[PDB]
Design a protein around this motif. Structure first.
Motif, PDB file in Angstrom:
ATOM      1  N   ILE A   1      -9.719  -7.385  19.840  1.00 30.81           N
ATOM      2  CA  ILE A   1      -9.342  -7.255  21.245  1.00 30.81           C
ATOM      3  C   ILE A   1      -9.732  -8.542  21.956  1.00 30.81           C
ATOM      4  O   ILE A   1     -10.832  -9.066  21.743  1.00 30.81           O
ATOM      5  CB  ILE A   1      -9.993  -6.035  21.938  1.00 30.81           C
ATOM      6  CG1 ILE A   1     -11.233  -5.525  21.175  1.00 30.81           C
ATOM      7  CG2 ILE A   1      -8.945  -4.931  22.132  1.00 30.81           C
ATOM      8  CD1 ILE A   1     -12.062  -4.495  21.929  1.00 30.81           C
ATOM      9  N   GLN A   2      -8.831  -9.044  22.802  1.00 29.45           N
ATOM     10  CA  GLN A   2      -8.992 -10.308  23.513  1.00 29.45           C
ATOM     11  C   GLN A   2      -8.758 -10.063  24.995  1.00 29.45           C
ATOM     12  O   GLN A   2      -7.638  -9.727  25.398  1.00 29.45           O
ATOM     13  CB  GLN A   2      -8.014 -11.365  22.994  1.00 29.45           C
ATOM     14  CG  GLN A   2      -8.122 -11.663  21.508  1.00 29.45           C
ATOM     15  CD  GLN A   2      -7.115 -12.702  21.058  1.00 29.45           C
ATOM     16  OE1 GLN A   2      -6.463 -13.348  21.878  1.00 29.45           O
ATOM     17  NE2 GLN A   2      -6.982 -12.868  19.748  1.00 29.45           N
ATOM     18  N   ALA A   3      -9.810 -10.243  25.799  1.00 30.68           N
ATOM     19  CA  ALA A   3      -9.779 -10.031  27.239  1.00 30.68           C
ATOM     20  C   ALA A   3     -10.196 -11.307  27.952  1.00 30.68           C
ATOM     21  O   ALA A   3     -11.147 -11.976  27.539  1.00 30.68           O
ATOM     22  CB  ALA A   3     -10.705  -8.879  27.650  1.00 30.68           C
ATOM     23  N   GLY A   4      -9.473 -11.641  29.017  1.00 30.70           N
ATOM     24  CA  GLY A   4      -9.780 -12.805  29.818  1.00 30.70           C
ATOM     25  C   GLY A   4      -9.141 -14.072  29.278  1.00 30.70           C
ATOM     26  O   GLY A   4      -8.601 -14.124  28.172  1.00 30.70           O
ATOM     27  N   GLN A   5      -9.210 -15.123  30.099  1.00 23.40           N
ATOM     28  CA  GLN A   5      -8.623 -16.404  29.720  1.00 23.40           C
ATOM     29  C   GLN A   5      -9.377 -17.026  28.551  1.00 23.40           C
ATOM     30  O   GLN A   5      -8.773 -17.415  27.545  1.00 23.40           O
ATOM     31  CB  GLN A   5      -8.614 -17.347  30.925  1.00 23.40           C
ATOM     32  CG  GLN A   5      -7.890 -18.671  30.690  1.00 23.40           C
ATOM     33  CD  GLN A   5      -7.749 -19.498  31.955  1.00 23.40           C
ATOM     34  OE1 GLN A   5      -7.716 -18.965  33.064  1.00 23.40           O
ATOM     35  NE2 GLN A   5      -7.666 -20.813  31.792  1.00 23.40           N
TER      36      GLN A   5
ATOM     37  N   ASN B   1      -9.006 -14.979  25.255  1.00 23.30           N
ATOM     38  CA  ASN B   1      -7.750 -15.209  24.551  1.00 23.30           C
ATOM     39  C   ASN B   1      -7.747 -16.554  23.840  1.00 23.30           C
ATOM     40  O   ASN B   1      -7.144 -16.687  22.769  1.00 23.30           O
ATOM     41  CB  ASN B   1      -6.578 -15.124  25.528  1.00 23.30           C
ATOM     42  CG  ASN B   1      -6.395 -13.731  26.102  1.00 23.30           C
ATOM     43  OD1 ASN B   1      -6.567 -12.732  25.405  1.00 23.30           O
ATOM     44  ND2 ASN B   1      -6.047 -13.660  27.381  1.00 23.30           N
ATOM     45  N   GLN B   2      -8.412 -17.561  24.413  1.00 26.89           N
ATOM     46  CA  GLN B   2      -8.439 -18.880  23.790  1.00 26.89           C
ATOM     47  C   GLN B   2      -9.286 -18.873  22.523  1.00 26.89           C
ATOM     48  O   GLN B   2      -8.835 -19.321  21.463  1.00 26.89           O
ATOM     49  CB  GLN B   2      -8.960 -19.918  24.786  1.00 26.89           C
ATOM     50  CG  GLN B   2      -8.006 -20.217  25.940  1.00 26.89           C
ATOM     51  CD  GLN B   2      -6.778 -21.003  25.513  1.00 26.89           C
ATOM     52  OE1 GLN B   2      -5.650 -20.522  25.626  1.00 26.89           O
ATOM     53  NE2 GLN B   2      -6.990 -22.220  25.028  1.00 26.89           N
ATOM     54  N   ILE B   3     -10.519 -18.367  22.612  1.00 32.03           N
ATOM     55  CA  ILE B   3     -11.368 -18.302  21.430  1.00 32.03           C
ATOM     56  C   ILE B   3     -10.835 -17.285  20.432  1.00 32.03           C
ATOM     57  O   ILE B   3     -10.990 -17.470  19.220  1.00 32.03           O
ATOM     58  CB  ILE B   3     -12.835 -17.997  21.818  1.00 32.03           C
ATOM     59  CG1 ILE B   3     -13.004 -16.564  22.362  1.00 32.03           C
ATOM     60  CG2 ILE B   3     -13.330 -19.034  22.829  1.00 32.03           C
ATOM     61  CD1 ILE B   3     -14.343 -16.295  23.030  1.00 32.03           C
ATOM     62  N   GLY B   4     -10.205 -16.211  20.911  1.00 29.27           N
ATOM     63  CA  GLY B   4      -9.578 -15.269  20.003  1.00 29.27           C
ATOM     64  C   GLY B   4      -8.383 -15.873  19.291  1.00 29.27           C
ATOM     65  O   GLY B   4      -8.141 -15.585  18.117  1.00 29.27           O
ATOM     66  N   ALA B   5      -7.625 -16.720  19.991  1.00 28.79           N
ATOM     67  CA  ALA B   5      -6.509 -17.414  19.357  1.00 28.79           C
ATOM     68  C   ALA B   5      -7.003 -18.365  18.274  1.00 28.79           C
ATOM     69  O   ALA B   5      -6.382 -18.484  17.213  1.00 28.79           O
ATOM     70  CB  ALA B   5      -5.699 -18.174  20.405  1.00 28.79           C
TER      71      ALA B   5
ATOM     72  N   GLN C   1     -14.002  -5.776  17.601  1.00 28.58           N
ATOM     73  CA  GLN C   1     -14.414  -7.162  17.806  1.00 28.58           C
ATOM     74  C   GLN C   1     -13.799  -7.659  19.110  1.00 28.58           C
ATOM     75  O   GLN C   1     -12.592  -7.914  19.176  1.00 28.58           O
ATOM     76  CB  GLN C   1     -13.981  -8.031  16.627  1.00 28.58           C
ATOM     77  CG  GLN C   1     -14.613  -9.412  16.608  1.00 28.58           C
ATOM     78  CD  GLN C   1     -14.292 -10.178  15.342  1.00 28.58           C
ATOM     79  OE1 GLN C   1     -13.378  -9.815  14.599  1.00 28.58           O
ATOM     80  NE2 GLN C   1     -15.045 -11.240  15.085  1.00 28.58           N
ATOM     81  N   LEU C   2     -14.637  -7.804  20.138  1.00 28.55           N
ATOM     82  CA  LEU C   2     -14.213  -8.184  21.479  1.00 28.55           C
ATOM     83  C   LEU C   2     -14.535  -9.648  21.736  1.00 28.55           C
ATOM     84  O   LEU C   2     -15.554 -10.166  21.264  1.00 28.55           O
ATOM     85  CB  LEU C   2     -14.905  -7.314  22.535  1.00 28.55           C
ATOM     86  CG  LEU C   2     -14.453  -7.426  23.997  1.00 28.55           C
ATOM     87  CD1 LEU C   2     -13.123  -6.722  24.221  1.00 28.55           C
ATOM     88  CD2 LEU C   2     -15.520  -6.859  24.915  1.00 28.55           C
ATOM     89  N   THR C   3     -13.652 -10.308  22.487  1.00 31.62           N
ATOM     90  CA  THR C   3     -13.861 -11.660  22.991  1.00 31.62           C
ATOM     91  C   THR C   3     -13.587 -11.655  24.486  1.00 31.62           C
ATOM     92  O   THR C   3     -12.450 -11.411  24.910  1.00 31.62           O
ATOM     93  CB  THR C   3     -12.954 -12.666  22.282  1.00 31.62           C
ATOM     94  OG1 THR C   3     -11.602 -12.191  22.299  1.00 31.62           O
ATOM     95  CG2 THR C   3     -13.403 -12.867  20.846  1.00 31.62           C
TER      96      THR C   3
END
Ligand SMILES: Nc1nc2c(ncn2[C@@H]2O[C@H](COP(=O)(O)CP(=O)(O)OP(=O)(O)O)[C@@H](O)[C@H]2O)c(=O)[nH]1
Ligand SMILES: Nc1nc2c(ncn2[C@@H]2O[C@H](COP(=O)(O)CP(=O)(O)OP(=O)(O)O)[C@@H](O)[C@H]2O)c(=O)[nH]1
Ligand SMILES: Nc1nc2c(ncn2[C@@H]2O[C@H](COP(=O)(O)OP(=O)(O)OP(=O)(O)O)[C@@H](O)[C@H]2O)c(=O)[nH]1
Ligand SMILES: Nc1nc2c(ncn2[C@@H]2O[C@H](COP(=O)(O)OP(=O)(O)OP(=O)(O)O)[C@@H](O)[C@H]2O)c(=O)[nH]1
Lengths: 426, 427, 426, 427
Positions: free
Chosen positions: A7-11, A14-18, A134-136
């Motif tokens: 799961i990717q939340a916030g700007q 999403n960048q570190i998750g990408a 796994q959250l970012t």
């Protein structure tokens, strides 16, 4: 087997998750289109632990990107690996939070949380056996701290038995790109301490300090910082992705590293971190990288560990190595630094090893650290929160969404509870 | 994401014709009205291979609408959007509000209503006017109150042109300024300000234009107003929305009067000899002589600040720049907000006009600083008003319009309450 | 096994230290890049005593170059062998000392000593067994005398059991390239006598005298002077680098040559020292080079040994030779010069031999000499110190960094203690 | 490592335009402003393929700034750095300090402040002026005191042009010289001096220029001031930093007035017939007629000396040269400093100007000697001042500026205390 829902939340999340999906896709050998081109068979053996089998031997990631603005998804979708993600997972609103914890937690998140909870439900039911989440996210801003913390509480009540991994970057006083950062930080940790069983406290200035001293890069951008924090995410989840002589699941790390339920805010790290010109002048052996892991420079948080004492530390090694050298190195680091380790635990150093190292490196190791020095970063956020709260500065925007000042006082009491808890075991 | 921008008065439309020429040059839009998602927030898609702005130039006097209709940007702007009145405001806050204002607001308020229906991502509003006269004070204040009761929740970015202490154009300007601010204090979420003599100081010492005009003044205004919305038009490392100027700058709902200043400003021959990096522009934007409004920040304390950059600007060096600004004890931040910085980065560089006075640069910054330094400016504006109010100077025109001595005193005590708050918050 | 950590402080220390790594790299057969190309297997057997194994069979030197200016490292890094050193070891400040002992000891060194002590710690822990520290510095200037002496005191308390080697060049009245040289010299010897267990007192004018008379070179530059002093450093450390019939470690030399703890200021030497044209007219046998070693010309200090008496002298021979000729030659030199040797010691001549001579020479020997004649160089520095101190000349610059005149008087008392001690045993 | 150099007065800028042409020729910088780490200490990197000096030419009279702006070095120097005043100093220490000085220092003090922010390795300062008039005495002394309170710790290298005993240009020069030295005695860490008649002696007997001008005088000044900083620009066998001139030459914090002299000086046709090695230049630099200031060193004693060489100069022979100077009993060193020598070597040779009067040489030396020989020069300057002070000559101009008889006597007794120290230290 033991699927983990990302799961990717916030700007920033999403960048570190990408970058997280980019770096592990090279480890498994996945093309940007989604097809497999790996060289080893072990890469495909545990590919289902994040990805799902599809037609044409395509592998889609279980990444649920959430954000209260549409422009963030356009940059991620238009990236190098942006075409591998599922279009259905790209769920997002229109109006941003504007760096407000109350908007993403009461008004902007409440209208969107009903839509995203249906997306994670179908992904969790399709798996063989759910392991954790796994959250970012980021404590700064409104969409990361407000909405990103809210969805965990809904997932906590829905899956109370499953673990919750959160890689949460948080602000610092030296590097502060937001005026309303301590309010978002103080309110978010109140929700994280009760819900999340795991929290990797990463600081931005330490990543700037890591890239400046040990790496000495000339022009570090945000993409270079994401490469450091993304490697730590791939390092913790190595044992359940490749074989190893001493496997340690994410739940196995939790039992060893979480001595009390609230003391789950750790200090991650990664090694080796070397420049392009200083690679030939360095040996890849295990004893030299071990002292680099316990060094204050390599750690990704601004707190110097010598100002406190380690509760319990974990070193997830990687690559073919000697177990005796790993077992003897973990002894001498705690022997000659016995003042910086608690006497009421006989052995504080957890260890694990894997056989398949990262691509491009022969041996590596990732540092996860629980210590009382982390309270230094909380109190500076606390006094920043108390300095602005004692005259009700920048609160009237929060009250517009129905939020009360009592919750700010409750978050302040929890912030006082956090720093006093780490001081007890120091 | 979308936004609409109206213009009021001589000062508004002279900014409007001067700023929209810069917007059409950034997106490759020719002056004839034609040449993906970058121009959507300002320009619409007019069927196929044609665009139109989302703006309306309204003024009571017809001197300014007819030249835009017969100028060079005839095909770019919609002919029906160019609204023209019938009778002049004559530098009277009352005349442009009640007599001439009431008969024309019904056309423009319903026009912007249906102009929003075709839109879907309306983030807020930004207006351009000047309280130094009648149209920008009377007709604007009637527009703000009638829009706040309809929408209310949406933001409003006021860009007014205030007079200098000694330099001025009109003679009855503090009456128009003090009367309209009684309504603007509560209906405006944020209001940036510009002075007429300070901007001459910008082009004198730095740009070295010994004979400037209002055409040159508006081109650097276009750089300012286009920089604040540059994050919405193009992607960046750290994008900032239009609503970020409400949360990160307004500590209290009635203290919403920040300053403005911009850097770098450099001529053509000096652009090639001067080095351009983030250090000196960060040192120059806090310089008191390089400000767009005549206020000494050394006397006051900064409440909130926001830095937004453009072009190739990495994030590691700008964080070091603000760290050098904090340890510099020349300026001083207020104890009620130690983390008084909001950083923003954008990859799209600053553009230049063909034949314009400003030179090309690889990077730039727009510094909007919230502080209590405007309190002495308001007290000076109120001080000069008390001398004319005691003799009842220029009062027979306003009472001949319909008003009386009541709102004169209500505007005075309301301005006194504004001074009482700025001295209380600065403690 | 018995690793020695090298350290280079000051401008002259970096130059002679750079020549030290150059001359021994040819003995071991190391390329400038760092790869091994030696002809014998014994060269690689004791390569770990200075170097460390790295990837690709590369060997990095344990040279910690420290200096308070950045331009000195650029000349060393841009040298012939400048590319072999580690980039991490190049630690340095920005502001120079400007030939001031107080700046490098209180202000410029104190901010930098915390950074360099972390560099020597990791290098000392990575070794198998630490033997000692080999320092190269100069009593002239501020960075060599002030900071170079200060780091030894920190290393003394950290490693009190390990020996301390210091090859310290010192000024002379005939060749003086600095106005503030006696203050830097008088203050430095106060710190050297208490901390350092070994000190090679080298004089610059003797190196000019050596190159002029016995070598008769036409245009001696500083690089030619470094070749002489660098060979003495390679000669003392020969026994623990190659096999020999009578090995003598650096600690073995200390026990034989240091009869009292303060009498550790010796007079080094090297032989054979011949011109290019006078090589054919000379035999390489052992008796002819032995009398050259005990000659006043060959010694690298301005003090004539005939004005005093030898306390105890060491001759570390090299190359295949007859032990009887070495044992009989050391007898006759002390027999026919019994007036110049102390009667209260029965045998003053220590000796050692190695099997692997230097490259290009078949036989060689290095002279280390303890004698009472060395006090002549101290008193001329003392009267220069007393001449400038008695009217407080050039002291106000030292007091700016918080230094007191009592420390100058204490250094003057220690200087009086040194010359009186050597006069006792004369 | 970096440094900045300002220029004041007619004497300063005529050295500035004459010395910076030599600096740009060494590093291959063309006059048009363009062509690695050698030019960094004087010239900055202006983006890509362009440089600018770190200097400012300031003068109250506009006669000297306009010709540099319209000269041949138009593109090399920054146009904004060339500061120009409004009113002439008129050879008055008071007028260039208080009336005209106070209104212009605020521009230049803030300019050099922000000019240091882009810099990072600022070692110190070196200024160029002359106390023979008003601008180099009044405006310079106001600049030194206001810079010492801001920075203080950084070094300052004063290069003033003092008058000869009988030859002179002005007539009221000792009033300007004695008044400004009251402030320069405590704020200057070191101050090298030059005379106007001695430098004519340099070009007369050696260079054989029977009709010289100030252009020829400044070219050999450029060789002097560029030689002292030659160690920072290029590598050498024994490099010396700019701070070495503070420790090795100043025995006491108020005795900081050394002399200067330079060798070899030889014409074109004489360069090929004369042998050039380190011996004769070491014998020639101590020659009393080859000095840049009219003082007899045989009467006094040397306190400290420093020798810095250039070009192919080995160290073994120069140590023998100074040994021959010590045993020579013609000169005599003071007993308080027997080791009065500081040797310096640099590999970069001395350059020559295209078409210049000085010939090319493989090596050179710059001899700055600290001694008590300036005491008789100061007493002679004070002696001629007492004749004019007794009659109150030229006093009505200074008191008409604002001053009075107080600082006239304070400058007199302070100069008397300077004489009292030089006779005490020479014992
Ligand atoms: N290491 C990185 N840090 C980042 C990056 N982008 C932002 N940040 C840092 O995280 C801070 C806040 O995180 P975000 O950018 O995500 C703010 P958020 O999107 O959650 O709220 P809104 O944008 O207002 O809707 C931010 O101030 C940076 O210090 C990044 O790409 N990498
Ligand atoms: N035999 C050699 N002697 C040298 C060499 N370089 C300098 N020296 C001598 O050593 C004396 C002082 O040593 P240094 O040059 O290192 C002065 P230091 O660097 O320690 O202080 P600063 O340069 O002021 O920071 C110096 O005056 C010379 O007589 C050299 O390369 N070889
Ligand atoms: N900076 C700037 N200010 C302007 C410009 N044009 C007009 N102004 C300001 O506008 C003020 C007058 O305000 P208005 O109400 O618009 O005057 P008006 O439109 O002529 O109204 P009437 O006189 O009643 O017809 C003047 O004092 C100017 O300072 C401009 O192009 N640039
Ligand atoms: N050696 C040398 N001296 C110079 C040069 N130019 C000017 N001077 C000296 O400068 C002195 C005058 O000093 P200033 O204060 O600069 O005179 P000014 O700038 O004309 O000041 P005003 O007369 O007030 O306008 C003269 O006595 C000259 O000796 C030069 O190029 N070389």
């Amino acid at each position: 087997m033991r699927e983990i829902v990302h799961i990717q939340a916030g700007q920033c999340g999403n960048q570190i998750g990408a970058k997280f999906w980019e770096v592990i896709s090279d480890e498994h050998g996945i093309d940007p289109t989604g097809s497999y081109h790996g060289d080893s068979d072990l890469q495909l053996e545990r590919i289902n632990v994040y990805y799902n089998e599809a037609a044409g031997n395509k592998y889609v990631p279980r990444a649920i990107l959430v954000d209260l603005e549409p422009g963030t998804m356009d940059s991620v979708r238009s990236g190098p690996f942006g075409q591998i993600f599922r279009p259905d997972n790209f769920v997002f609103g229109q109006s941003g939070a504007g760096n407000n914890w109350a908007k993403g937690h009461y008004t902007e998140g409440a209208e969107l949380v009903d839509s995203v909870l249906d997306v994670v439900r179908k992904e969790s039911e399709s798996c063989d056996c759910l392991q954790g989440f796994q959250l970012t996210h980021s404590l700064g801003g409104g969409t990361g701290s407000g909405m990103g913390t809210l969805l965990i509480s809904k997932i906590r009540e829905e899956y109370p038995d499953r673990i919750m991994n959160t890689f949460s970057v948080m602000p610092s006083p030296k590097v502060s790109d937001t005026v309303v950062e301590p309010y978002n930080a103080t309110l978010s940790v109140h929700q994280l301490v009760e819900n999340t069983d795991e929290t990797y406290s990463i600081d931005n200035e330490a990543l700037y300090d890591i890239c400046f001293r040990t790496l000495k890069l000339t022009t570090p951008t945000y993409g270079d910082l994401n490469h450091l924090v993304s490697a730590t995410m791939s390092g913790v989840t190595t044992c359940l992705r490749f074989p190893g002589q001493l496997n340690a699941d994410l739940r196995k790390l939790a039992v060893n590293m979480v001595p009390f339920p609230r003391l789950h805010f750790f200090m991650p790290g990664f090694a080796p971190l070397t420049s392009r010109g200083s690679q030939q002048y360095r040996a890849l052996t295990v004893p030299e990288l071990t002292q680099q892991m316990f060094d204050s420079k390599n750690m990704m948080a601004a707190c110097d560990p010598r100002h406190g004492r380690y509760l319990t530390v974990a070193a997830i090694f990687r690559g073919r190595m000697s177990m005796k050298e790993v077992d003897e190195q973990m002894l001498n680091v705690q022997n000659k630094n016995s003042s910086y380790f608690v006497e009421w635990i006989p052995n504080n150093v957890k260890t694990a090893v894997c056989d398949i190292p990262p691509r491009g490196l022969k041996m590596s190791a990732t540092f996860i650290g629980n210590s009382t020095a982390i309270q230094e970063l909380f109190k500076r956020i606390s006094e920043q929160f108390t300095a602005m709260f004692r005259r009700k500065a920048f609160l009237h925007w929060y009250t517009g969404e129905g939020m009360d000042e009592m919750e700010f006082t409750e978050a302040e009491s929890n912030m006082n509870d956090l720093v006093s808890e780490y001081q007890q075991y120091q | 994401r979308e936004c609409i921008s109206i213009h009021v008065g001589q000062a508004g439309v002279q900014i409007g014709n001067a700023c929209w020429e810069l917007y059409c040059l950034e997106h490759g839009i020719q002056p004839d009205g034609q040449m993906d998602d970058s121009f959507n927030t300002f320009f619409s898609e007019t069927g196929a291979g044609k665009h139109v702005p989302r703006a309306v130039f309204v003024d009571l006097e017809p001197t300014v609408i007819d030249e835009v209709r017969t100028g060079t940007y005839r095909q770019l702007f919609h002919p029906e959007q160019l609204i023209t009145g019938k009778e002049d405001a004559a530098n009277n806050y009352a005349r442009g509000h009640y007599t001439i204002g009431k008969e024309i607001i019904d056309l423009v308020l319903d026009r912007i209503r249906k102009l929003a229906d075709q839109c879907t991502g309306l983030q807020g509003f930004l207006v351009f006017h000047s309280f130094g006269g009648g149209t920008g004070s009377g007709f604007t204040s009637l527009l703000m109150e009638r829009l706040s009761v309809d929408y209310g929740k949406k933001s409003k970015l006021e860009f007014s042109i205030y007079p200098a202490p000694q330099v001025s154009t009109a003679v009855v300007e503090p009456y128009n300024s003090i009367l309209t601010t009684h309504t603007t204090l509560e209906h405006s979420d944020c209001a940036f300000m510009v002075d007429n003599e300070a901007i001459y100081d910008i082009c004198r010492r730095n740009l070295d234009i010994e004979r400037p005009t209002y055409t040159n003044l508006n081109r650097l205004i276009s750089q300012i107003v286009s920089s604040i919305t540059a994050s919405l038009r193009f992607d960046g490392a750290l994008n900032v929305d239009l609503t970020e100027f409400q949360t990160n700058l307004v500590p209290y709902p009635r203290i919403h009067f920040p300053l403005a200043t911009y850097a770098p400003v450099i001529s053509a021959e000096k652009a090639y000899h001067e080095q351009l990096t983030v250090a000196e522009i960060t040192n120059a934007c806090f310089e008191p002589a390089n400000q767009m409004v005549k206020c000494d920040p050394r006397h006051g304390k900064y409440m909130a600040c926001c830095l937004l950059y453009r072009g190739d600007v990495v994030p590691k060096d700008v964080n070091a720049a603000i760290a050098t600004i904090k340890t510099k004890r020349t300026i001083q931040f207020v104890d009620w907000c130690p983390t008084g910085f909001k950083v923003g980065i954008n990859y799209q560089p600053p553009t230049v006009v063909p034949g314009g006075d400003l030179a090309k640069v690889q990077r730039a910054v727009c510094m909007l600083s919230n502080t209590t330094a405007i309190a002495e400016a308001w007290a000076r504006l109120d001080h000069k008003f008390d001398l004319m109010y005691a003799k009842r100077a220029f009062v027979h025109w306003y009472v001949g319009e319909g008003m009386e001595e009541g709102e004169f005193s209500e505007a005075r005590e309301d301005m006194a309450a504004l001074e009482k708050d700025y001295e209380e918050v600065g403690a």
